Design a protein around this ligand. Sequence first.
Ligand SMILES: *[C@@H]1O[C@H](CO)[C@@H](O[C@@H]2O[C@H](CO)[C@@H](O[C@@H]3O[C@H](CO)[C@@H](O)[C@H](O)[C@H]3NC(C)=O)[C@H](O)[C@H]2NC(C)=O)[C@H](O)[C@H]1NC(C)=O
Ligand SMILES: COc1ccc(NC(=S)NCCCn2ccnc2)cc1OC
Ligand SMILES: [Zn+2]
Length: 322
Amino acid sequence: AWTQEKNHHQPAHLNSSSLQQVAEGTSISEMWQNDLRPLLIERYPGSPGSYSARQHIMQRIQRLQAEWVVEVDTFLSRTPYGYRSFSNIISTLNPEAKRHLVLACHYDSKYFPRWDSRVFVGATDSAVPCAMMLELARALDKKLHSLKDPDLSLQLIFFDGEEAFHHWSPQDSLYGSRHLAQKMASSPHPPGSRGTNQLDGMDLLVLLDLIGAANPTFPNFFPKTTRWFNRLQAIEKELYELGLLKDHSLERKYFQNFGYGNIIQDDHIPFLRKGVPVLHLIASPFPEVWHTMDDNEENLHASTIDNLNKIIQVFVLEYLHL
Ligand SMILES: *[C@@H]1O[C@H](CO)[C@@H](O[C@@H]2O[C@H](CO)[C@@H](O[C@@H]3O[C@H](CO)[C@@H](O)[C@H](O)[C@H]3NC(C)=O)[C@H](O)[C@H]2NC(C)=O)[C@H](O)[C@H]1NC(C)=O
Ligand SMILES: COc1ccc(NC(=S)NCCCn2ccnc2)cc1OC
Ligand SMILES: [Zn+2]
């Protein structure tokens, strides 16, 4: 059964040369200027910035050569402030492909009462993760473009409404991912399949969150995807050894497995709940700047994001056999 393929899917390793290509092909400063900065705005759901951010994300995807099919899953859901609109953004290569590797972030920024001139823009949470996805799509565009010709491709999801409006709780969090997981569960896939839905199609949900601080460490949360966590470790290591990372030794590997991490609630939960395999790339411990105004551009550490861009881009190419 094809739904079972994700369970045996193996990455196709890049050699030294293809790794050097990947490291050369991403530009942190182009991500910064073109993908990240336009997201460094207040963009809690329903805010002006939410729309700008959504448009930006979609523009950035659409300008690429790969044949990304962009959809916005817009819906209203009750929050502590009443019903609010949310729009997940889903960008899919080869929407007909039974399987997709899914990379995800949340693109909303947490609402805080506007009490002074500053606004919370959640640079790590998760503008950088989103900008990373965009950068990945761009850096890998030519290879990903070639997927037009395993029935497996790539999807990006930018969840809206990850953040609680008032106080984090299962009623007040994950609005976009709860909604979308539910939607994909009621979405047979491939179309006119009887018993399979888009969730079945999710080979792996790699959810990036809280990235952009110096010296992140990403726990390995799930036995199910430990082999993929291991691939990140291997990639970090080989990139390190090829002198393709910057300002980063393996003294404090990003990908440190100190045993199965205690699960952190985030947009993967509604998917994990349905048995979607998850790789949850959230920094833990959280950045000192977490949910403060200083989670901002200034406190971002570019080399770290650039390293992780290389690592993730390799992961993705290898997953996709590109
Ligand atoms: C690291 O891996 C690289 C990528 O896999 C190797 O380079 C690859 O070598 C293949 C043959 O040795 C190429 O096959 C060719 O593919 C192109 C399209 O990409 C076609 O036009 C050609 O017809 C085809 N050749 C034949 C005889 O049919 C791979 O495309 C090529 N890949 C890339 C990205 O250049 C590197 O050599 C390898 N490095 C080391 C040190 O092993
Ligand atoms: C490992 O166990 C943890 C459990 C709970 C928390 N605290 C919170 S609130 N978790 C939800 C975070 C949701 N999120 C993501 C981005 N913005 C908000 C921290 C943890 O370890 C560091
Ligand atoms: Zn947050």
